[model samples]
Target: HWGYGKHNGPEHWHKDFPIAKGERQSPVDIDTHTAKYDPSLKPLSVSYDQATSLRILNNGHAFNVEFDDSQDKAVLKGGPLDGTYRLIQFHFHWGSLDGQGSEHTVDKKKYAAELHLVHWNTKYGDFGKAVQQPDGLAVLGIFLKVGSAKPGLQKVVDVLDSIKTKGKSADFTNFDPRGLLPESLDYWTYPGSLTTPPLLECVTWIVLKEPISVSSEQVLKFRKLNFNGEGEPEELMVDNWRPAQPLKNRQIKASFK
Candidate 1:
């Protein structure tokens, strides 16, 4: 029952999952001053066929849009990766207030929210098997700023009312995740682990420097989601992000200067 609540929050996770204290943990503060510009890094390549999108659900944590990864219909390659990675799902992390929500901060600055596009290396066979390998996963992190309403985001937020509680889901098809990405693919790359528990150190985090915009009204709908299931004591889903972990021996490389 690891959650963002006071009893079982990130501070208490290390007791259950020892990797919580691992060196490669994620959501580190992106210090722009120390981030080195690597000219060798290639531009990230992403392709998604809208039909790959399947459904959206509240999995007791954050709501995510699952994808049909049976084939290479949607994939990410290049930019700090050795092989193609299939898009499995995408989720979000946010806080109750607009002033602070994003998991990763830029120069100690926080955004209203953060979007994570989860993918697995096709060479690893399946997502389950991939999670065990070092270079098995690649997560694209896009920061969400509170500003103009994003059209692509609205499509997902519109369904929030339907899946209000944990385990609730709805059919969501023909939705291309590429539409949710910011105009710029320029990003910061690092070796890190998943932000959530079973905190495996198996991800190549590619966090975009530019953030996509969403209205405060839209973010308010995200908070309406519940961590508890129907008939259970209701708890609003907010501040579901883990605070920044130590950088340790890692170096953050940027594609842009």
Candidate 2:
């Protein structure tokens, strides 16, 4: 599949996934002065059940924690979404140890890391079908910083050793994604595509303003993660973020002034 390497990175993604160069792309640089506050936006309603969390998998691209989306056990609504979205899975984007690797930037400044809590519209049969439509997906982006150890992230770390290599997966449960969210729900929303291959233009981006914290030691642990599989030469998984893309004619609306 696609990777964030110099040869097959963001610039080359368009070659395989034609939509990569499309008008609506993700990880746009959010300029405070340029973004307009929309009073019409509603408060984000995140309802989640810790039991919905199923397994954690290292797909070489990134570590994704899958959830049981069978019964709308976890759902996110309101905010900028035109409708409700069910939590399907969540993942992360980060850089090397003691390095900056967040995908989205605020006024040209990047945080230490980023979190993507992905969801699909309940109207769709499943995530596979949702990707083919227009109003299909909604992703919540949470920024992360290096400081005190984040209590919310402990479960993720607890399972990492088991999924250290690509294709590795382990049982992960009773971990609610809501606990990982920050204090503030203030966010910027816009139309954009997934940062990875297929590059589907089906997401309504919701990025949080306030960032959560992680310990310096935890940051290093993320860097030690390997992107290659068991028999393959190990490549350290770091800098797994796409650079900020251009903002076409789309306007970014904010929840707070």
Candidate 3:
């Protein structure tokens, strides 16, 4: 519910999200010189059809979606990701306060926040079981930059008033998340674990090189979501992003023309 502020911030999210202990924590700072660094790799192709028919769920922390693998036909080939993976859930990481957001930091600059589109390999059956496999998951990381004016993220912000209470969710139908994709799909790929608890080591991370900009006010609106019960007043849930992690013998490759 409430995060990055008061008594229930990122340090206390585990009590609620619980999956914090998983090896798959997000918001990792990507470094190029890590021991796992590799060059000359391509991004796997993802069909628009596969990205559609996704089940979107609001888990209090952020907006997430579960991919219906049965309807997907995309495959991750070449590079660090080499398999058929289906989207599972997609969520976001933000700051409770302002000026500091983003789960993964590059160099030392932090953005307003980061969005993760989580996916898993169909070979592992379902998302639940696939989370345990080394290469069973793939996550697309998109960074959010804060600006003076609203960045047109209001489409999502407008719905917050409906699901302001913690643990409360609504069906976000007819919404195409692909619209959220940056103009440039060119991204950096690597083999890394989740930034959250349990920190599972089964993800092929595809981080977009370009970031989408949003207004500072929109960033503030994100922090307004409730982290507690409906009876309780909604607390400002700012700065919900986790700190960056070590590269840990990982190779980060990029796909660019």
Highest lDDT against the true fold, candidate: 1
Candidate 1 Cα deviation (angstroms), residue 37: 0.5
Error of 3 at 90 (Å): 1.8
Question: Candidate 3 lDDT, tens digit per residue, 157-216?
Answer: 777777776676666544456766777877777677676644577778888879887787
Off by over 4 Å in 1: none
Ranking by TM-score: 1, 2, 3
lDDT of 2 at 18: 88
Residue 121's lDDT within candidate 3 is 80
> Which stretches of model 2 miss by more than 4 angstroms?
97-99
lDDT rank order? 1, 2, 3
**Which candidate leads the pack in TM-score?**
1
Instruction: Write one digit per residue (lDDT tens) for candidate 2, span 172-242.
Output: 88787877989989999999988888889999999999999999877777887898998889898999999
Candidate 2, pairs of clashing residues: none
lDDT preference between candidates 1 and 2, better one: 1
The clash count for each model shown is 0, 0, 34
All candidates: CA RMSD (Å): 0.8, 1.1, 3.8
Query: What overall lDDT goes with each candidate model?
Result: 0.94, 0.88, 0.66
Candidate 3: residue 28 lDDT (0-100): 64
